[PDB]
Amino acid sequence: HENLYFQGMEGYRLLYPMRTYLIVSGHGEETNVMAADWVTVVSFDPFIVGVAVAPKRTTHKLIKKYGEFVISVPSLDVLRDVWIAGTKKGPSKLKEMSVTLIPSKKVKVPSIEEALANIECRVIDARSYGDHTFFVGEVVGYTYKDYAFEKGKPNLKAKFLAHVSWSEFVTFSEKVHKAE
Amino acid sequence: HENLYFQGMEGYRLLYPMRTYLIVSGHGEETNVMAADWVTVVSFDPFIVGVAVAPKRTTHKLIKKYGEFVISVPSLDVLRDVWIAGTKKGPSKLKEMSVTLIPSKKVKVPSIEEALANIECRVIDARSYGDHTFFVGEVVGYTYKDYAFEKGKPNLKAKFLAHVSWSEFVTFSEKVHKAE
Ligand SMILES: Cc1cc2nc3c(=O)[nH]c(=O)nc-3n(C[C@H](O)[C@H](O)[C@H](O)COP(=O)(O)O)c2cc1C
Ligand SMILES: Cc1cc2nc3c(=O)[nH]c(=O)nc-3n(C[C@H](O)[C@H](O)[C@H](O)COP(=O)(O)O)c2cc1C
Ligand SMILES: Oc1ccc(O)cc1
Ligand SMILES: Oc1ccc(O)cc1
C-alpha cells in the first residue's frame, strides 16, 4: 500500500481475503469504473450498502457530483478488466476494458452487462473516517444474471471474485459446508 | 431472513458470498460472541473498521455499554461455534462453544484463542442506517496466528470462512490467479 512508512503487513490484511467489486460512477462521457474491496451491506429493510472511497479516486469526485453509484459484481473471468479498473485512473480507462455499459433502471449511472449483478445506489450519507469517505447508498434498483443466483442464492459456479493480496485473487470452493 | 413480507431473494444476497466473522463484546461474565457478515475496512491509516449490528442483538447492547469490540476471524474448522454464535442469544451461549477466551492487548473485551486473528476496536461512531447500527471502530491492537498470515498475506490453507446462504458456508480455492 502506498504511504506505509513502517514496512510490514498492513493491519487491514487481517480481514482478507475480501470480495472485490466494481464501482461505476458518472454518466455519459464521464462514466468511470474502479475496483473496490471495502464494500458491505448496512441494512436489510430498506436495503442499504456502503463503500469506502479515498478522496484521491476520480470515483470520489464523481459520486459527490452526482450522488449515485452502481456496485457491479465481477467474476474471475473479467479479472483483467478489474485490474485495469483498480490501477488506471479516470474515464479514459474504459477504452481499455472489455466491459459493456448498459442503462440502469433507476439511476443515471450505467450498469455493466458482463457483471453478475448490478446494484443501483443513491447516496444518503458520506462520513469521513481516516483516509477514506464511507459513501452510504440506499439501493433503488438492481439487475443480475439469472444463472449466478439460481434458486435465490449465489451459484458458486459463477466464479465470484475475491482478493488475497496486492496482485493475487481467488474464487470460492464449490464444496458447500452445511451448518444445520 | 425474518421480516421478509414479499417472498423472494433478499436483495442483499447479491453481494454474497461474504466473509463471516465473530464479534466479541462485553467482559467478565458479560462476555458475548455473535456472528457477523456485515463487516468491512473503512480506513488504512489510521486502521478503522465497521460492523452493522441490529438493535435487537445482545451484542448491540454490549457495544453501546462498553464502547469496545473485537472482530475475531474464524476458520471453517470452528463452523459449529460460528453457527451457535449466529443463532443463540446472549453470554449463556458461550457454555456451548468450544472457544477459549484470552485477554486482549488494549481492549477490555476478550479475544478468542482459536481465531485466526483478533482485531481490537474502540467505537468512534455509531450511525443508524435502516434496521442496523453501523458501529465504526478504530483499531487499537491486534493479534493473529502466525501461520494464517505467513509472508504478510493470508494463507489460504487456513480455511477462512465465507457465507453463501442461510445455512451454507464455503472457504476459498487454493488456486491463486495473478493479475500482473
Ligand atoms: C482489488 C482492488 C480493490 C480496491 N479497493 C478499493 C477500495 O475499496 N477503495 C478505494 O478507495 N480504492 C480501492 N482500490 C484502488 C482503486 O481501485 C484505484 O485507486 C483506481 O485506480 C481508482 O480509479 P479512479 O481514480 O478512476 O476512481 C482498489 C484497487 C484494487 C486493485
Ligand atoms: C453467518 C451469520 C452472519 C451474521 N451476520 C450478522 C450481521 O452482520 N449483523 C447482525 O446484526 N447480525 C448478524 N447475524 C445474526 C446474529 O449473529 C444473531 O442474531 C445472533 O444470535 C445474535 O446474538 P446476540 O443476541 O448474542 O448478540 C448473523 C448470523 C449468522 C449465522
Ligand atoms: O483504498 C484502497 C482500499 C482497498 C484496496 O484494496 C486498495 C486501496
Ligand atoms: O442482521 C443480519 C445481518 C447479516 C446476516 O447474515 C444475518 C443477520
Curated annotation (Swiss-Prot), chains A, B:
Q: What InterPro entries does the annotation carry?
A: Flavin_Rdtase-like_dom (IPR002563), Flavoredoxin (IPR052174), Split_barrel_FMN-bd (IPR012349)
Q: Which Pfam families match?
A: Flavin_Reduct
The cofactor required is: FMN
Q: Which UniProt keywords apply?
A: Flavoprotein, FMN
Q: Which SMART domains does this UniProt record tie to the protein?
A: Flavin_Reduct
Gene3D superfamilies noted in UniProt: Electron Transport, Fmn-binding Protein, Chain A
Q: Name one GO molecular function term.
A: FMN binding
Q: In which family does this protein belong, per the annotation?
A: Belongs to the flavoredoxin family.
Q: Which PANTHER family match?
A: FLAVOREDOXIN (PTHR43567:SF1), FLAVOREDOXIN-RELATED-RELATED (PTHR43567)
Q: What is this protein called?
A: Uncharacterized protein PH0856
**Species assigned in the record:** Pyrococcus horikoshii (strain ATCC 700860 / DSM 12428 / JCM 9974 / NBRC 100139 / OT-3)
